[PDB]
Nucleic acid binder design. Structure first.
Lengths: 262, 101, 70, 180, 124
RNA sequence: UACCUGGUUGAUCCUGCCAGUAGCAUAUGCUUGUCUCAAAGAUUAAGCCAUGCAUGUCUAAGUACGCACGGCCGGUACAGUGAAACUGCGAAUGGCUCAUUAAAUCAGUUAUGGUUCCUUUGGUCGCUCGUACUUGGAUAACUGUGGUAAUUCU
RNA sequence: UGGUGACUCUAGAUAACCUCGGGCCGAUCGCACGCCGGCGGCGACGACCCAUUCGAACGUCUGCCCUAUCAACUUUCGAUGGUAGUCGCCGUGCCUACCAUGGUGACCACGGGUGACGGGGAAUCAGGGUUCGAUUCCGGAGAGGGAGCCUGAGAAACGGCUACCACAUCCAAGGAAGGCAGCAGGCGCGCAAAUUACCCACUCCCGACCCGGGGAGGUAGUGACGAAAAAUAACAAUACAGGACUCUUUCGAGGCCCUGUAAUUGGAAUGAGUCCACUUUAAAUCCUUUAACGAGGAUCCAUUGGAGGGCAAGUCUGGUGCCAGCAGCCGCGGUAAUUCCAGCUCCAAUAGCGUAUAUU
């Protein structure tokens, strides 16, 4: 290479996009944005592959360039704009609202939310720094920087912000016994309560999480998103409630659903 | 005395029996560099054009097993044929190379 | 005499049925004889057999399926 | 770089010893009472049986409470019971190890057309299959090696677009009727 | 008569102002139905004028009892002319393209980049 | 399918190899009816190349006195479409090949608390105590005169 | 003030500095026009700095084939380290100046070789292994060989520039121009590898951009590399031949069945092809769907290797007579050839089957 890369091969694309092999040689290649390339869903895939509102990319371009899609309250006309975790998608013509939160299998789920629930979002805070004239600044997981946050807010907490103004409405601390979602690694998509944090100086901390069914799983500290105060989430959960069923229980659920209806 | 022989071919059949007699005499006497060209591929419909090109290669392949046929329909195909004739490795006939002619 | 490196070898043509199809200074395609670099079971010093003469096979000339150009 | 895939398998294996009298008699017998075209179909069915046996004996070495042994054993047993090569009461891995190639050759569409009385012989059944005279409940099937499930057994009907079936006469009868 | 039409996966796409669906055509002993008759039957089904229905991608199953394709019914002809591919509009006769190969355009473009000025327009 | 068979002696038992046997890849010979996929100038010469094509780009939103066209209404600076050209961006992606390269590349694992960054996204953008109801000079495109056998020369 | 596991971190205060080859503090453009000359709401384009994204670049640990007929190697001309600086985007012998004599090695240094780009991976596979990976994904390198640059955020760029070396083009002889290890195509080399085709409709990329471009890519063409499915007949009557069953001690008798074999008849069924239409598609082709024609020597004719053993299948007949030849090996052929050349018959695989070579 002599500079930055502009193409993404279809088999090099993230597996949670669920792109097939024989449609083309290339994958949509998310443009630069608030979310990482391996941890985002472009607008073209969400509108075309997921919602089936379009069949080709030019149709997605028509939908985008009619200024119908809103991401986090702002109109996006980029077909490959990286939409990521907790992002709110508003389609005012069809009157739909979505929050990109993970399915239990580790994939972005089509999750419909109430319009009044689309007025806020949660952000895990990445860093805090005092900038010039002694002004505290807050940087979250989607590149949002806020001047003058609450002094009790520290790193690895979660802020609930209003999307119209971008100001902190509330916050949740990283304490033992709080609700969290795993946003990376093997346990991706699982919702539980924090029971531990194993501090390794010079290395990664370890958060042990206990599920609602009694199942325990550890993750890195960077893979934890605090979503609730103790036991109740501050967002709406998908069809699955974060519990990962084993393949035997999923088989039993499939057979029971086939038996009851069919 | 020639340096290259251009064999003209029928699109439908390979050659007549007269052409087979001429080919037997030319093979026995000695072949210089040769090129095969088909004359009548344009008159047919296109589906029949492709199928008859396949059938013609099948028919000719029992005497010229690895030789590419050309086409003689337009002036640009003639130009490609002339360029092919110019740049081509020369089969050398051992008899006429020693005596003057 | 091989074209690609100038080395001279001795190749086996099967019979007087086939030997009369080879004249002097013809271009012959030659294979190994079968024992991976070892000699024929009766005649010594030969490890190769003639496969094609004048860019046409010996089997199609022995069986009369083709004729060779001169 | 293309939008093409290159996944492909060989579906049989040629035998190690080519000329065995007992083996030649066995495969020729199987071709005989099953109306098969050549030896490659025997080798194909033997290959699928060998794959199933290899999977079963790999699963059998695990501990009997292993989750993967339970899941893959139940899946293999259900797949064998679905096509009628295992009985509904013989769902265990030892019974998988006890299977034979005749059980899989019995489940072909050609054999089932012969058995259900749609044809007078096994070769007539193959010719009848290949000539689009047979359907499986909606769908004309050309393939004699179509393995019939248990829910397709009572549905091998007889191609309502054929002279033998629905009733439009064929080419030869239509031409012969025009002679008079 | 004996040829029937059903629509399977209906969807009201308000973002491109249309209705999109999967079309199952049953013709037990006929050929594959021409898209014109499918369009008239869809117009009769959905109570619309037949020039706003665009159908494509019909594949007839082995044996020949069923054909499956895709279709969309637009709100008007203007939304059709806005949101349809050019080739489907040309299939319906509403669009026409220039008759020029890629070789002519490419060789012309490479020819007029040897020339600077208004004389670029003088290359034919 | 955790497999062997023939060959030394007059005969036997053996060490031992050769030969057989089955797959896989390249070439080749003979033959070839249907249909679904599908590799393909790598090996030898990272040898040499005729010709053609493969990188260009405009929105309401940088610069429109090309009638190149064009409705006005007739002093309305510029209606509008728009070649050219200036300006901005891209051309560092892609594609090809495997010559070099032997702790080198590369794979996993870590660090930048030792660095750089077009773009996107967010913040910041009266925080400076010191002609503006708008500043200056050109240069293309255009017009005209030319030089060279020749050029995407000027 | 705030942070880290740890700052010479971030933030604060003071004294100054602040480069003309100069650092921010908007002399920019569009759309609706409206409230009390003034106030204005949407955007676009810039914009020092901070964070973010895409990365890039230098480091950490461990991991590579063959060779001792390579046993000692490095050190002026940096080899290992120290001090100060230069240069660099930055850490650093990166370089310079001054000092120390260090650094590596039978745990294989150093040197040479490779028919060596590395990896994901592929073939084979009881278990263990052995061989391969030029090749569509990731990373590296290169654009005939070296070297030096310009612009730019990013290149030591070659579908950019400047030289030299080797080639090679045009010429009015003064001069000018070049780089297919891009897509086709050609020559050469060879045992060895496709069309100078159509299109941006799909996948995506770029741009001022919903509109343009793309030999990236898609689609056809050649294509027995390889993989999958699968025709070349089936049935009925008649005639012989067997096997069962009934009555017979048996021979025998069975419109008693079943199954074969046809120099015997018969119409039934279908594809292969020929060719309307629809469908397919950017427009086509092919496939699929359907009209019409389309089979008895159903001449609408299946080949490739073999028949002594290994190894399945002839001591048949004619010809040759240690010749011609066959034969992987043992061997056959010298006048009764189970093996050569043929006819007939038989065997194995089958739209495939031999041969050479690499490798398991």
């Amino acid at each position: 290479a002599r500079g930055p890369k502009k193409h993404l091969k279809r088999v090099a694309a993230p597996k949670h996009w669920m792109l097939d092999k024989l449609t083309g040689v290339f994958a949509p290649r998310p443009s630069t944005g608030p979310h990482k390339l391996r941890e985002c869903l472009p607008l073209i895939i969400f509108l075309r592959n997921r919602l089936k509102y379009a069949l080709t990319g030019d149709e997605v371009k028509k939908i985008c360039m009619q200024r119908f899609i809103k991401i986090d309250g702002k109109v996006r006309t980029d077909i490959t704009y990286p939409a990521g975790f907790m992002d709110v998608i508003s389609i005012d013509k069809t009157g739909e609202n979505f929050r990109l939160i993970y399915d239990t299998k580790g994939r972005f789920a089509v999750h419909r939310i109430t319009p009044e629930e689309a007025k806020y979002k949660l952000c895990k805070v990445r860093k805090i720094f005092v900038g010039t004239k002694g002004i505290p600044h807050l940087v979250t997981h989607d590149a949002r920087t806020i001047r003058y946050p609450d002094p009790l807010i520290k790193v690895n907490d979660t802020i609930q912000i209003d999307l119209e103004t971008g100001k902190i409405t509330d916050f949740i601390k990283f304490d033992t016994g709080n609700l969290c979602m795993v946003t990376g690694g093997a346990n991706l998509g699982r919702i539980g309560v924090i029971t531990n944090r194993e501090r390794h100086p010079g290395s990664f901390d370890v958060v042990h999480v206990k599920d609602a069914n009694g199942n325990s799983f550890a993750t890195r500290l960077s893979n934890i998103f605090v979503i609730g105060k103790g036991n109740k989430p501050w967002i709406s959960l998908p069809r699955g409630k974060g519990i990962r069923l084993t393949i035997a229980e999923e088989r039993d659920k499939r057979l029971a659903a086939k038996q009851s209806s069919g | 005395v020639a340096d290259t022989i251009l064999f003209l071919l029928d699109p439908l059949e390979g050659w007549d029996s007269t052409g087979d007699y001429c080919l037997s005499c030319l093979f026995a006497q000695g072949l210089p560099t040769y090129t095969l060209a088909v004359q009548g591929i344009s008159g047919l419909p296109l589906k029949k054009q492709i199928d008859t090109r396949k059938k013609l290669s099948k028919a000719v392949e029992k005497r010229f097993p690895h030789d590419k046929l050309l086409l003689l329909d337009t002036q640009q195909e003639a130009g490609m044929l002339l360029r092919q004739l110019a740049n081509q490795k020369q089969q050398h006939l051992a008899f006429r190379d020693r005596r003057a002619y | 005499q091989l074209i690609k490196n100038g080395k001279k070898i001795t190749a086996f043509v099967p019979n007087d049925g086939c030997l009369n199809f080879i004249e002097e200074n013809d271009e012959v395609l030659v294979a190994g004889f079968g024992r991976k670099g070892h000699a024929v079971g009766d005649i010594p010093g030969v490890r190769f057999k003639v496969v094609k003469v004048a860019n046409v096979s010996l089997l199609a000339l022995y069986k009369g399926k083709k004729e060779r150009p001169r | 770089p293309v939008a093409r895939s290159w996944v492909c398998r060989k579906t049989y294996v040629t035998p190690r010893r080519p000329f065995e009298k007992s083996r030649l008699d066995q495969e020729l017998k199987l071709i005989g009472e099953y109306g098969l075209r050549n030896k490659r179909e025997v080798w194909r069915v033997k290959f699928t049986l060998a794959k199933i046996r290899k999977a079963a004996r790999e699963l059998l070495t695990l501990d009997e409470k292993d989750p993967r042994r339970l899941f893959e054993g139940n899946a293999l047993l259900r797949r064998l019971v679905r096509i009628g090569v295992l009985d509904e009461g013989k769902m265990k891995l030892d019974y998988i190890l006890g299977l034979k190639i005749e059980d899989f050759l019995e489940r072909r569409l050609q054999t089932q057309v012969f058995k259900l009385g749609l044809a007078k012989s096994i070769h007539h059944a193959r010719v009848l299959i290949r000539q689009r005279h047979i359907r499986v409940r909606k769908q004309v099937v050309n393939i004699p090696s179509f393995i019939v499930r248990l829910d397709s057994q009572k549905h091998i009907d007889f191609s309502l677009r054929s002279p033998y079936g629905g009733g439009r006469p064929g080419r030869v009868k239509r031409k012969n009727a025009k002679k008079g | 008569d004996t040829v029937t039409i059903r629509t399977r996966k209906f969807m009201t796409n308000r973002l491109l102002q249309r209705k999109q669906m999967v079309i199952d055509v049953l013709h037990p002993g006929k050929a594959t139905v021409p898209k014109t008759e499918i369009r008239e039957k869809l117009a009769k089904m959905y109570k619309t004028t037949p020039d706003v229905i665009f159908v494509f991608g019909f594949r007839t199953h082995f044996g020949g009892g069923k054909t499956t394709g895709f279709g969309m019914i637009y709100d008007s002809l203007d939304y059709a002319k806005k949101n349809e591919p050019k080739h489907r509009l040309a299939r319906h006769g509403l669009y026409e393209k220039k008759k020029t190969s890629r070789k002519q355009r490419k060789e012309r473009k490479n020819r007029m980049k040897k020339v600077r000025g208004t004389a670029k327009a003088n290359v034919g």
